[PDB]
C-alpha cells in the first residue's frame, strides 16, 4: 500500500492521495484539467481532455508503470456535445504511447470540482 | 493482461476493450442497451435493463466466467423512477443464474453515450 | 474467498445487492448512503450526512476484519458541490480521527441519489 505523490499532476485541493500501490495494482484519484505548474484550466475540451489523460499518466508512471498499464478508466463529464472530441485525444492518446484501449466507462454527470469539462480516474497492473 | 473479444455483446463505439482479464479480476466497460446483432436501443425501460445486463454476462462468459462470478456492478441511470422496474430485472437477472448478488452502486446520471437510460460497468473474480 | 459482508451497524440491503463482499486480498463496498441503521431516518444536514455515510461505510469494512487505514479508493457521489468544502471537513476529520492516509477518490456532482440524499460513498479496502 505505497503512496503516490509527484509534480507532473496537481496537488490535492482536498482529503485524497493522487494515487495507491496495492503492489498488483494502482488506483488513481479522478483527475481534473488543472495544470501540475500553474494551477490553471485550459478553456478547450481538446485540451481539457489531453491535460487529465497527462495527469493521469503522471501518476501511473511514478508508480513505476506505463499508459499500456491501464486496464480500467473512468470518463466523467458534463457535456455530451464534448464526446467526440475527448475520443479522439484519448484515441491519439492511447496511440502515442502504442496501448491498447483499456475497458472504459463515460458518463454525463451533473457538475465537476471547479467546472471542468472532465475527471478521469484509472486503474494500472503490474504485469 | 488479455484483452476480451466477444459478438455476444457491442463491438466499441469508441477507444476502449468490452473487456479485460487480469488472471486473477476481470472488469467490464459499462454495458449500454446497445444491441449486439442490430445496433437497436429498445424503447422501453425493461427492455433496456434487461439487454445492459445481457451485454454484461456476454463479455463476463466469453471471459470463462458466469454471472454468480460478478461481485461488484455500477448502475448508472437517467432516471430514478425507472429505479423499481431496473431493480426487478436486475434480480431476476440474478435470480435466474442462481447468483448472489453483489455489491452495487446506483446513481442518476445527467446523461449517458447514446441517450441510453442505463450504463452498468461489472468486476468478476476467477476462483 | 467471494464472502458476502453482513452488518446491523450498517442499513440493510433490501434489494438484490449485498452491503460488501470480501475477496481475501480486498474488499468492495455498496455505495453507501446517509441512512441511519437504528431510526432508518435521513438527517437533514450535510454534515451529519456525510459523517453517517463514512460511518456506514466503516461498519462494512469492520464487519470485514479490517480497519479505515485499509481503505483505498473512494467514490463520493454528491448532488451539489456547493456542498463539497462542507463533505470535505467533515471526510478529512473521519480519516484524521482515525490516523488514517486519505485513499484515492473521485468526486462528482450527480443528477440524483437513492432517497433524496446528498451523496453515496463507495469504497473498496485492501486486507494487507
Same mark, same amino acid.
Given at each position: +500500500?505505497?503512496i503516490?505523490?509527484?509534480?507532473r499532476?496537481?496537488?490535492?485541493?482536498?482529503?485524497?492521495? /493522487?494515487?495507491?500501490?496495492?503492489?498488483?495494482?494502482?488506483?488513481?484519484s479522478?483527475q481534473?484539467?488543472?495544470?501540475?505548474?500553474?494551477?490553471?484550466?485550459?478553456?478547450?475540451?481538446?485540451? /481539457?481532455?489531453?491535460?487529465?489523460?497527462?495527469?493521469?499518466?503522471?501518476?501511473?508512471?511514478a508508480?513505476?508503470?506505463?499508459?499500456?498499464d491501464?486496464? +480500467?478508466?473512468?470518463?466523467?463529464?458534463?457535456?455530451?456535445?464534448?464526446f467526440?472530441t475527448?475520443n479522439?485525444?484519448?484515441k /491519439?492518446?492511447?496511440?502515442?504511447?502504442?496501448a491498447?484501449?483499456?475497458?472504459?466507462?463515460?458518463? /454525463?454527470?451533473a457538475?465537476?470540482?471547479?467546472?471542468?469539462?472532465?475527471?478521469?480516474?484509472?486503474?494500472?497492473?503490474?504485469?
Amino acid at each position: +500500500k505505497k503512496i503516490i505523490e509527484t509534480q507532473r499532476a496537481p496537488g490535492a485541493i482536498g482529503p485524497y492521495v /493522487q494515487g495507491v500501490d496495492l503492489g498488483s495494482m494502482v488506483f488513481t484519484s479522478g483527475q481534473i484539467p488543472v495544470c501540475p505548474q500553474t494551477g490553471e484550466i485550459p478553456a478547450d475540451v481538446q485540451d /481539457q481532455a489531453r491535460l487529465s489523460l497527462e495527469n493521469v499518466k503522471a501518476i501511473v508512471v511514478a508508480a513505476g508503470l506505463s499508459v499500456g498499464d491501464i486496464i +480500467k478508466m473512468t470518463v466523467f463529464i458534463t457535456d455530451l456535445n464534448d464526446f467526440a472530441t475527448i475520443n479522439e485525444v484519448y484515441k /491519439q492518446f492511447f496511440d502515442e504511447h502504442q496501448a491498447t484501449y483499456p475497458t472504459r466507462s463515460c458518463v /454525463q454527470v451533473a457538475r465537476l470540482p471547479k467546472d471542468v469539462k472532465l475527471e478521469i480516474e484509472a486503474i494500472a497492473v503490474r504485469s
